[PDB]
């Protein structure tokens, strides 16, 4: 390194130079008293949208404002305090006569963009990195009580997936399991962080594999391997069919959350699992309407 | 042995129960967190960028849903005309809908702390003008005219090479807290109106368009919060996801 | 509905006192000019005048002025168009219309039934 | 005083023709010319304003352009309704000068 490029050279800088600063902001901003302002030159109220910043005009330079003191907390308002609450996930159904599940056991990939709530809540943000508390409730389709004895195995991608309710894989000599009776309390485990990435995108603007992309493979297109967290099966322990049709039914609390990238939340009803597909012929402005912009 | 005695709200699954559970993976590390811009730490972080806020909501059909996006504002009779008018209720249903504050605040019963609606006119640089934007408080009418208006808080806007004005709508409330309103009883809860009235005219000089839009864009103040954490009540799923 | 109704056909004699009413419903009324425009038989629309009920504030026709006086009534929301001497050569349709909402440049967007004025001996 | 002329005084064209009438002002009203579309024993009825703006609740075969001095509608294709009386008035000054007047009927 003798050449003066090289000595002054800014090549291989990897530290973040951000121009911003978190600050401790347990609850809103107090509010200042403010007078009238009778001059020229200066101008809070007039801003320039253009430059694509937020306004800094505050209600002091355009009111005449009190000295409140605002003891509001903002502590409600984290990730924690919006995601650390048990939503519907997964719903498995083990029916005694059906196609669905007919021989007492079901495999369900871990995916949690299923139902509305929680994948529009999660989908908030691009990124998300948090462990998780996944809580089961068993029981009949009337929702009654009785005496079974189920097995939850968790498959990671790359182990043997039961082919039937007696496979050699629910021998779980490595798989992590739970023996559950219907009549004990919901199960409840806590799973950590599994992706091989930092975070779970619940977006992939981009194909898994490299190679041609024609129109057959095109359904490979925003699928993330690292957000493919296995399997969760489920099976009656025995040897012969259980009496009773089963449900269970999969919550996900999260905990510890980071999230980045916030996004614009949905607005179209989903269609797929997985998938941003909607309705071309039913698009449904945000809100409501009104007959005329002057009446309310 | 050690003696015990369960209590009522034995075996109960809460699902906003802050508890430990058994792990399943013994000994397992997570890959580690490397850096990616853009973290957020509170949600009212967002609450804080200002979103488009559809004044104009009156197309429905998918073919001019982007005309929702702006509202007119053309040369008049210089008589302290109407320009628009809408509701300063976050949280309700209307413009609002479509900003991010609305929809963070549809997951959220009670909310406090002042807004902001930014107004960008969007017309030729030879056009001039001057707006009335008006914040009537809980109470008052919808104004029948720009002088009942004017009573109310309000800014006077004039084009210019700022393109955009601020209208603060200051949180004027006798609730440390308001819940979201609606009609019927909880319009207890209504925060005001806001208008736009002509100030004195839109003028234009041969060769430039007699029409332009603003566009709106509405925020919320460093003192605003929100509290009382619920399931939203915007959209709602029919066709369950396939 | 947005709509205006006016008085009905009219028969006088030439040198009488006539005021054709027309009332508008379905919106405000000190916030739109109304005006009027005459249609001799056989003939086009004319343009007559334009009335802002709020503050009301006339303009006139220069070939109009003089002869009809344009008025209106926010109380009950209802503009007039009253003659001080009818002549013969006032038989004719005459139009209330309400100017555009969205501004008053941009012409007559609603119209009224009309009123058909005979006046003759 | 603006004085508004239109032309041809009277025109006739089959269902599906392509109308077109032009209007002519003394003055340059820039872009404020209303044109109105009356039947006979019948009310007038916006169809454009601004010389080029449809009216809400008027079909898309009806067209305004122009400016300035020179104006013009355009009936993409014609229909049975359409064989009307189509007036142009400017509203840019006072008086509001209504058009003479353009008359479309039916061809044989």
């Known amino acids: 390194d003798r050449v003066a490029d090289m000595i002054e050279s800014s090549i291989g800088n990897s530290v973040s130079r951000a121009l911003t600063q978190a600050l401790p902001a347990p609850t809103g901003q107090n509010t200042q008293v403010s007078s009238h302002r009778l001059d020229t030159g200066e101008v809070p109220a007039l801003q320039a949208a253009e430059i694509g910043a937020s306004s800094n005009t505050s209600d002091e330079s355009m009111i005449e404002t009190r000295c409140v003191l605002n003891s509001h907390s903002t502590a409600e308002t984290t990730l924690d305090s919006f995601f650390s609450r048990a939503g519907l996930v997964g719903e498995i159904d083990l029916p005694l006569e059906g196609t669905t599940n007919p021989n007492g056991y079901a495999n369900w990939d871990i995916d949690i963009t299923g139902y509305a709530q929680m994948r529009r809540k999660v989908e908030l943000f691009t990124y998300m990195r948090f462990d998780a508390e996944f809580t089961f409730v068993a029981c009949t389709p009337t929702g009654q009580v009785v005496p079974q004895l189920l097995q939850y195995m968790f498959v990671p991608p790359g182990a043997p997936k039961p082919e039937s309710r007696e496979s050699l894989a629910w021998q779980t000599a490595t798989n992590p399991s739970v023996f559950v009776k219907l009549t004990d309390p919901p199960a409840q485990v806590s799973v950590p962080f599994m992706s091989p990435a930092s975070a779970y995108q619940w977006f992939y603007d981009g194909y898994p594999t490299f190679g041609e992309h024609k129109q057959e493979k095109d359904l490979e297109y925003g699928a993330c391997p690292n957000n493919m967290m296995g399997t969760f099966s489920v099976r009656t322990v025995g040897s012969s069919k259980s009496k009773y049709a089963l449900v269970v039914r999969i919550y996900m609390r999260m905990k510890h959350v980071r999230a980045w990238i916030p996004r614009p939340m949905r607005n179209q009803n989903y269609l797929f699992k997985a998938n941003p597909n909607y309705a071309g012929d039913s698009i449904k402005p945000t809100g409501t309407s009104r007959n005329a912009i002057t009446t309310l | 042995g050690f003696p015990t005695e369960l209590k009522p709200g034995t075996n109960q699954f809460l699902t906003t129960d802050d508890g430990v559970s058994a792990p399943i993976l013994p000994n397992f590390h997570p890959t580690p967190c490397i850096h990616i811009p853009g973290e957020v730490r509170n949600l009212l972080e967002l609450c804080q960028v200002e979103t488009i806020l559809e004044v104009n909501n009156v197309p429905t059909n998918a073919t001019s849903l982007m005309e929702r996006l702006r509202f007119p504002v053309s040369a008049q009779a210089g008589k302290g005309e109407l320009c628009a008018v809408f509701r300063a209720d976050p949280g309700r249903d209307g413009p609002w809908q479509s900003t991010m504050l609305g929809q963070l605040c549809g997951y959220y019963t009670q909310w406090s702390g002042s807004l902001e609606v930014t107004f960008m006119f969007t017309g030729s640089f030879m056009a001039t003008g001057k707006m009335l934007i008006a914040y009537t408080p809980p109470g008052g009418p919808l104004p029948k005219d720009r002088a009942t208006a004017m009573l109310g808080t309000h800014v006077i806007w004039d084009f210019g090479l700022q393109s955009s004005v601020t209208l603060v709508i200051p949180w004027i409330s006798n609730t440390h807290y308001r819940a979201h309103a609606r009609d019927g009883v909880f319009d207890y809860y209504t925060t005001g109106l806001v208008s736009i009235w002509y100030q004195t005219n839109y003028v234009v000089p041969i060769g430039a368009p007699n029409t332009a839009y603003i566009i709106a864009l509405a925020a919320a103040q460093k003192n605003f919060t929100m509290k009382l954490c619920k399931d939203t009540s915007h959209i709602l799923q029919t066709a369950s996801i396939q | 509905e947005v709509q205006l109704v006016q008085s009905g056909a009219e028969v006088k004699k030439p040198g009488e006192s006539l005021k054709i009413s027309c009332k508008g419903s379905?919106?405000?009324?000190?916030?739109?000019?109304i005006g009027w425009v005459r249609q001799m038989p056989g003939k086009g629309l004319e343009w007559m005048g334009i009335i802002y009920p709020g503050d009301s504030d006339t303009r006139y026709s220069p070939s109009f002025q003089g002869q009809v006086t344009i008025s209106a009534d926010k109380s009950i929301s209802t503009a007039y168009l009253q003659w001080s001497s009818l002549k013969a050569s006032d038989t004719a349709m005459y139009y209330c219309?309400?100017?555009?909402?969205?501004?008053?440049?941009?012409?007559?967007?609603?119209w009224g039934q009309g009123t058909t004025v005979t006046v003759s001996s | 005083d603006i004085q508004m002329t239109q032309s041809p005084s009277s025109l006739s064209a089959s269902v599906g023709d392509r109308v077109t009438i032009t209007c002519r002002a003394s003055?340059?009203?820039?872009?404020?010319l209303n044109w109105y579309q009356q039947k006979p024993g019948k009310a007038p009825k916006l169809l454009i304003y601004?010389?080029?703006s449809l009216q809400s609740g008027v079909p898309s075969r009806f067209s305004g352009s122009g400016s300035g001095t020179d104006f013009t509608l355009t009936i993409s294709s014609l229909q049975p309704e359409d064989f009307a009386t189509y007036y142009c008035?400017?509203?840019?000054?006072?008086?509001?000068?209504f058009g003479p007047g353009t008359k479309v009927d039916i061809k044989r």
């Open positions: 379905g919106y405000s009324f000190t916030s739109y000019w």
């Open positions: 219309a309400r100017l555009h909402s969205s501004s008053w440049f941009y012409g007559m967007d609603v």
């Open positions: 601004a010389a080029s």
């Open positions: 003055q340059s009203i820039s872009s404020y």
């Open positions: 008035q400017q509203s840019y000054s006072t008086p509001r000068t």
